[PDB]
Amino acid sequence: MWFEILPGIAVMAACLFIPGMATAHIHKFTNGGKEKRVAHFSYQWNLMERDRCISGVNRYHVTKGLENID
Amino acid sequence: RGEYVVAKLDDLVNWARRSSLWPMTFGLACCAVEMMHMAAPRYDMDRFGVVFRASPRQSDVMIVAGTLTNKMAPALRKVYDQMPEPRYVVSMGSCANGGGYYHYSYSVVRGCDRIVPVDIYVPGCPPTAEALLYGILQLQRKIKREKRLRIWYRR
Amino acid sequence: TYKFVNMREPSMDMKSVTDRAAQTLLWTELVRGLGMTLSYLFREPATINYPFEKGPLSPRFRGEHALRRYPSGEERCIACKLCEAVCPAQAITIEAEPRADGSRRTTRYDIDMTKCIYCGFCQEACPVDAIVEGPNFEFSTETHEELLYNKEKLLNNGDKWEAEIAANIQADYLYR
Amino acid sequence: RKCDPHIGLLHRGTEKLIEYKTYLQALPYFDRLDYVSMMCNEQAYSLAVEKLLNIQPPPRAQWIRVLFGEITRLLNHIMAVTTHALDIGAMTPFFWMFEEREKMFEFYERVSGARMHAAYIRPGGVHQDLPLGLLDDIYEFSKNFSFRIDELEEMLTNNRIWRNRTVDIGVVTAEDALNYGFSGVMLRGSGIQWDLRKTQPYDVYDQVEFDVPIGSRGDCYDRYLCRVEEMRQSLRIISQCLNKMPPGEIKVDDAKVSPPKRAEMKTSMESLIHHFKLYTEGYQVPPGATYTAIEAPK
Amino acid sequence: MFMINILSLIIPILLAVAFLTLVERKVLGYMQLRKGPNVVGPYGLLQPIADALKLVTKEPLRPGTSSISMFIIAPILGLSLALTMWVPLPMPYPLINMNLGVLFMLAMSSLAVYSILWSGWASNSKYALIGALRAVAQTISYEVTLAIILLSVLLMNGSYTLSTLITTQEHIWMIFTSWPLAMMWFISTLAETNRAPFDLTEGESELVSGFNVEYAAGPFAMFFMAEYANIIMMNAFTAILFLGASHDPHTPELYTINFVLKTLALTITFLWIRASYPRFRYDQLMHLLWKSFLPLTLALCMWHISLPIMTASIPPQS
Amino acid sequence: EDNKQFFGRHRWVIYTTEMNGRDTFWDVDGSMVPPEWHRWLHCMTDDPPTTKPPTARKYIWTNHKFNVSGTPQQYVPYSTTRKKIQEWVPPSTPYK
Amino acid sequence: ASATRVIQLLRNWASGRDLQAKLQLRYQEISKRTQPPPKLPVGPSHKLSNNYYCT
Amino acid sequence: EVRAAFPEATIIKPSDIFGREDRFLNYFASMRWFGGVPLISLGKETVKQPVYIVDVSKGIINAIKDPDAKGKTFAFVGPNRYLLFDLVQYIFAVAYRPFLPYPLPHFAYRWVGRLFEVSPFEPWTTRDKVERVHMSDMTLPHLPGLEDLGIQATPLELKAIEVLRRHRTYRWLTSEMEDVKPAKTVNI
Ligand SMILES: COC1=C(OC)C(=O)C(C/C=C(/C)CC/C=C(/C)CC/C=C(\C)CC/C=C(\C)CC/C=C(/C)CC/C=C(\C)CC/C=C(/C)CC/C=C(\C)CC/C=C(\C)CCC=C(C)C)=C(C)C1=O
Ligand code: SF4
Ligand code: SF4
Numbered sequence A: 001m002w003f004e005i006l007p008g009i010a011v012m013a014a015c016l017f018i019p020g021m022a023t024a025h026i027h028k029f030t031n032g033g034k035e036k037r038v039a040h041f042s043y044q045w046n047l048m049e050r051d052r053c054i055s056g057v058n059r060y061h062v063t064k065g066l067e068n069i070d
Numbered sequence B: 001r002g003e004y005v006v007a008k009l010d011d012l013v014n015w016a017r018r019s020s021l022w023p024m025t026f027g028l029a030c031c032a033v034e035m036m037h038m039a040a041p042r043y044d045m046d047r048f049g050v051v052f053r054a055s056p057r058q059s060d061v062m063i064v065a066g067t068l069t070n071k072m073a074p075a076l077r078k079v080y081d082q083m084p085e086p087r088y089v090v091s092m093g094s095c096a097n098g099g100g101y102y103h104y105s106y107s108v109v110r111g112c113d114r115i116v117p118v119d120i121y122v123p124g125c126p127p128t129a130e131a132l133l134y135g136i137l138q139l140q141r142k143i144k145r146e147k148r149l150r151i152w153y154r155r
Numbered sequence C: 001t002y003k004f005v006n007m008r009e010p011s012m013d014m015k016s017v018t019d020r021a022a023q024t025l026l027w028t029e030l031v032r033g034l035g036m037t038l039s040y041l042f043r044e045p046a047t048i049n050y051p052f053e054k055g056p057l058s059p060r061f062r063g064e065h066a067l068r069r070y071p072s073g074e075e076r077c078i079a080c081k082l083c084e085a086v087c088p089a090q091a092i093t094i095e096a097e098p099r100a101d102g103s104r105r106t107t108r109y110d111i112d113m114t115k116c117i118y119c120g121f122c123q124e125a126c127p128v129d130a131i132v133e134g135p136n137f138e139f140s141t142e143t144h145e146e147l148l149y150n151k152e153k154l155l156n157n158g159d160k161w162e163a164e165i166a167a168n169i170q171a172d173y174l175y176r
Numbered sequence D: 001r002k003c004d005p006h007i008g009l010l011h012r013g014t015e016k017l018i019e020y021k022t023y024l025q026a027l028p029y030f031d032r033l034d035y036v037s038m039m040c041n042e043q044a045y046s047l048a049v050e051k052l053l054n055i056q057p058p059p060r061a062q063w064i065r066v067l068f069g070e071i072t073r074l075l076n077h078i079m080a081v082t083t084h085a086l087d088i089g090a091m092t093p094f095f096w097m098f099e100e101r102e103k104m105f106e107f108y109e110r111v112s113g114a115r116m117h118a119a120y121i122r123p124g125g126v127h128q129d130l131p132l133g134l135l136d137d138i139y140e141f142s143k144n145f146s147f148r149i150d151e152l153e154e155m156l157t158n159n160r161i162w163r164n165r166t167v168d169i170g171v172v173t174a175e176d177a178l179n180y181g182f183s184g185v186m187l188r189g190s191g192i193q194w195d196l197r198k199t200q201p202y203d204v205y206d207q208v209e210f211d212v213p214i215g216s217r218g219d220c221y222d223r224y225l226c227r228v229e230e231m232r233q234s235l236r237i238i239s240q241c242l243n244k245m246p247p248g249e250i251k252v253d254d255a256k257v258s259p260p261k262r263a264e265m266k267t268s269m270e271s272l273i274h275h276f277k278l279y280t281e282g283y284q285v286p287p288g289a290t291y292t293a294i295e296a297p298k
Numbered sequence E: 001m002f003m004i005n006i007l008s009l010i011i012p013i014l015l016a017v018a019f020l021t022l023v024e025r026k027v028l029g030y031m032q033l034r035k036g037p038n039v040v041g042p043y044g045l046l047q048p049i050a051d052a053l054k055l056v057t058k059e060p061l062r063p064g065t066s067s068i069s070m071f072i073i074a075p076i077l078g079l080s081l082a083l084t085m086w087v088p089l090p091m092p093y094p095l096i097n098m099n100l101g102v103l104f105m106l107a108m109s110s111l112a113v114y115s116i117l118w119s120g121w122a123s124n125s126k127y128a129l130i131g132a133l134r135a136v137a138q139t140i141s142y143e144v145t146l147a148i149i150l151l152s153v154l155l156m157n158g159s160y161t162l163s164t165l166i167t168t169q170e171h172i173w174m175i176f177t178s179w180p181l182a183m184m185w186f187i188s189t190l191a192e193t194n195r196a197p198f199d200l201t202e203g204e205s206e207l208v209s210g211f212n213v214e215y216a217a218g219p220f221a222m223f224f225m226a227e228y229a230n231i232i233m234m235n236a237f238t239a240i241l242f243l244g245a246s247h248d249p250h251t252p253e254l255y256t257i258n259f260v261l262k263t264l265a266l267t268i269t270f271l272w273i274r275a276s277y278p279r280f281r282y283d284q285l286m287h288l289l290w291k292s293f294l295p296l297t298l299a300l301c302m303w304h305i306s307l308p309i310m311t312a313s314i315p316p317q318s
Numbered sequence F: 001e002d003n004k005q006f007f008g009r010h011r012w013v014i015y016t017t018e019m020n021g022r023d024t025f026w027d028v029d030g031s032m033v034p035p036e037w038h039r040w041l042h043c044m045t046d047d048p049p050t051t052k053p054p055t056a057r058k059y060i061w062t063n064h065k066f067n068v069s070g071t072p073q074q075y076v077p078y079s080t081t082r083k084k085i086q087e088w089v090p091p092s093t094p095y096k
Numbered sequence G: 001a002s003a004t005r006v007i008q009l010l011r012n013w014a015s016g017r018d019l020q021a022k023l024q025l026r027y028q029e030i031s032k033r034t035q036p037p038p039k040l041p042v043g044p045s046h047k048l049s050n051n052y053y054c055t
Numbered sequence H: 001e002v003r004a005a006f007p008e009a010t011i012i013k014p015s016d017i018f019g020r021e022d023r024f025l026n027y028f029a030s031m032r033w034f035g036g037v038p039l040i041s042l043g044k045e046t047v048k049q050p051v052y053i054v055d056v057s058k059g060i061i062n063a064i065k066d067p068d069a070k071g072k073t074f075a076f077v078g079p080n081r082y083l084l085f086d087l088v089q090y091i092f093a094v095a096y097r098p099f100l101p102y103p104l105p106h107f108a109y110r111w112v113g114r115l116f117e118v119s120p121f122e123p124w125t126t127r128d129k130v131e132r133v134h135m136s137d138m139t140l141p142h143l144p145g146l147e148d149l150g151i152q153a154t155p156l157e158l159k160a161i162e163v164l165r166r167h168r169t170y171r172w173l174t175s176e177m178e179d180v181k182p183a184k185t186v187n188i
């Protein structure tokens, strides 16, 4: 009766599930709900600094729309 | 009381040992072949926690199964000395329990105990693959009943 | 007669060559093994769980010895030393004496369970069915001394497994 | 480059101790000798003692000796091929047969009492007749077995990894193998068409038709097929033995050689006297020397 | 909270490595007409913990002839690489998103051999040196194609970043386009981890235990995780490399469930292969790869560079 | 017992919770099987003791015992014979 | 412990043969473990005359 | 007290006993772990006369067989007395580990012994143990020694590698006895 194999991989299935679950939610939590920004090039990194400077609270994941400008 | 926590840590340690003891790959003679039948799908020793690991550096119980002779007795005791602590030696079969059929010959040590501190004795010629299946489980009860830390907390 | 076993020359036709080339390139006999084990994965395991259920035996099984006694209660062994005379391992050691009643019993019947090899000759030996191995394959002990049985332990085994020995011998007394 | 095989780590003084035991008491020695071909071992010793005694076993005895001697060939060849793959690294084929060869050990115990060491095949015939229903149980297993022997062949015989690990490796030629004192598979594997069951048939092996697989390359691989083919050829022998089992006794009628049954033991003078001396002194065989060899599975 | 993420990527893996041992015992057993561990707790689910405590409370053998400092560095080096080489894996969102993920994949994979190397030397024995040097021979044939297959497959992905692998595999599986490479990658990933037909370095029947002969208790227990954490991670590498699942931008649950199932299916096949085939010979292994594998890699890599240009299907770099 | 079963699993025992004093919750063994049921359990017969009661006699035990190795009830070998050579007891009367 | 027909095909197909015709696990086809008492035969020399040992 | 309760009780008075599991040679051999080897006043004012384990073992056996052991009090001592500094010189030479002696005042060593006593497991060095290393084996010639029983004492020089072969690194593992010279013995 091969069902007994399943409990073994069942907890394992949850075991590998936690990391991907953790990283996605931790990124979602720390970075203001939005998905964590990716900076593979200097243009992205330069873009991130501008967001941080204009945020005022020194946090890139604080985006101010048209209400910021006049 | 410190006795309670010692007993709880006592039960934790031995339960790990009795449910994970690994019989060595140490076969000698007729008594070894049927012990394979214990590892065969019929009785499936592995289901009870044991694995048949070689390399006495990574084994707990030594299944001396077969005729123990003169020319190999140094090899066994060297092997037994290599096994880490704790280590148990189950003398398996009548040959290793005193000499078996060839008790009176000239190149057999009459009993595995004369070289090694021999644990629970399972008789048979050969003991059935089930006969020492109890022999392994009966050792698991011996591992269950030890005190160790209980003596240490009362030493 | 005899049969040749392996010299089968493979054909060199383009169909055969491509079949072998496909076999070597696209591993097939390796996949044949994988499909085999997977089929042999969804079977029913041949294991039996221990003591809750136990393996099957036969009435003539050979195990722990026992010294039975007559229906009256008198022991069967009249100390004829036949079992000692046939013991291949010389495990039997008995001495007799004229008992107080006048009957012919044995003072000592030490059977060394660490010497004898369960030939069963002893149960074939005595003409009164005195010594006989019981069905109890299980008597493993923690110390070497416990295995060296004397007359008293043999009688105790006779008194314990008497139900089995009477039934088993009843089944197989006709085959012998 | 050079391999010195130091042996002696299991030298029980068997041939020394036999000197001190009666012929009946020496029988379990051969049982323990080659502990994977038990019935074949006692068959060798029994034939020698019968030859010296100038006594033949009853027709029923010879048939079950052949029948049980052949499932013994099933046992050893199972052990040889499976542990081969085990030593090579293929663990799965080891376990599948060992469940099946566990079933054959049941037949061992049902007829003798012990799983391995039957001590059943004795000089002058077997100890006692088979239990009722034993032959039917043989038929059920023999039906299933050929459906597992091919299963082994599916696992290894055509496997490329097993082939390379075994093809054209450990190759021994014809003359050197013959000169080296080789026998059995070592001869049949290298092309020499020799088999004691055919050339010098003992017991009733002549009245049984079977083929002897002969290899051509003589290497490690060719012997693996030779052993596996010996499995199937043994199954044919078992099929004939079951179908041609004759009625009759199981030991030589001569009570001075084989012990009388327990029935006449307890009523007749001569039977008890013979049983007494046979189990105390044993049958005195005539002086002389002989060398009897049989086609043991090894 | 980045530290919380680090443990959330270490401890959940560690239990996954632990239960692979129990799963392998049961998978191997049920492929053997056996039952596998089922007495330690229910269904044998407590078995890894039973072995867990025994090993860490087992007598840790120090061999006298061993070089102690190198003796202890090897178990540390083996486990440290195993965990840190999980960090660039793009489980929905990778923990460590780097433009050169696969290069870092190869670097610590190549660093892994020095565990079995230094341990084999430090054990100071015949079987120790035999296992360690055949470990060289096994792994020496191994990086040359491992890089080539990685290069050829990724050449149409766009770059070495692991995150963009999902975008490339958005429409169809990578295995549909490079199945000749996938079989060859799979054998090598089965091979880099010293598993199933290629386990010469351990070689139970022929080297008793190889490098692990003089390694007991935790030093052994550490060696088991490095071997088994590399099994799961390499299969996870193959799962993203060739069977990249769909990724909803708003629900990372979807990819995580699909990705984990792919890793489980692949890891079972590792046990599937481990049960079935026999074990190669380290000369045949080298001959198998540098005489049959490597020639196919070069032409297949030749095909996979010519193909994007000829079809005007080169992938974006950014 | 279940006839529709792979041979070997068709008969099984659920061990007692108490036997001769010792607690036989989770720790159990194979020797706690009384003889009369040992035959039926090991497929030595197809007749349970309830259907066929074994023939009762005086000397048969009324309480089965497990293997008593380890516990202070374990069996110790000892010579069952009498003394062979005694000695000439010296007299009580003095020298003179 | 009978396999579900769904996997009966799986084991049959994956091995390319009909397992259910003949299985390794035994079942009710085995001979009964209790058999009637047998009557064994006598040997050829169980003759109460003309059975002299000299011949 | 025992002599009072059991007048005919043979009292054996062994000196420091050395052997495989002796905690005397191993004590100084294990001293290498904690930096150098600390000896109070370089241990130059403490003379020890150790005795091999087996001789005292045979002494007890011979005492049982001897019908004159009743009431007597034997003092089991070795053949030669060695100043403690030279003894440690001999031990570390046989083990080939470097010797780094350094003085240590008595009050500070007592403090060190106190710290080691804190361990709830087998202590490595107690304040009592520190005192024992300082206690030179008092010579009691009036006390019947070991040769009267019949056992000839085995000099520590012969059977010293037994205890200390284990402590040697792999480098000097196969080194024999004659490699290291016998240490100087302050004799009676
Ligand atoms: C000569 O004679 C012989 C015999 O008889 C004497 C025999 O019988 C047999 C027959 C018996 C057999 C079994 C046949 C096979 C046997 C052989 C010897 C043949 C050769 C073998 C092979 C080629 C294959 C060898 C395969 C092996 C060893 C399997 C390995 C894989 C496994 C999954 C099994 C082992 C699993 C283990 C040890 C369990 C997991 C390990 C752990 C360390 C436990 C987990 C630990 C932790 C998690 C660490 C602690 C951390 C925690 C808890 C985390 C939380 C805490 C924190 C602090 C973080 C043979 C063959 C024989 O030849
Ligand atoms: S006890 Fe019996 S079966 Fe075991 S090795 Fe000795 S003779 Fe062979
Ligand atoms: S069973 Fe055989 S070997 Fe054992 S005591 Fe009886 S006659 Fe001797």
Ligand code: SF4
Pocket: C076, C077, C078, C079, C080, C081, C082, C083, C084, C094, C122, C125, C126, C127, C128, C129, C130, C131
């Ligand atoms: S047990 Fe049997 S053979 Fe032995 S003395 Fe008694 S009656 Fe004779």
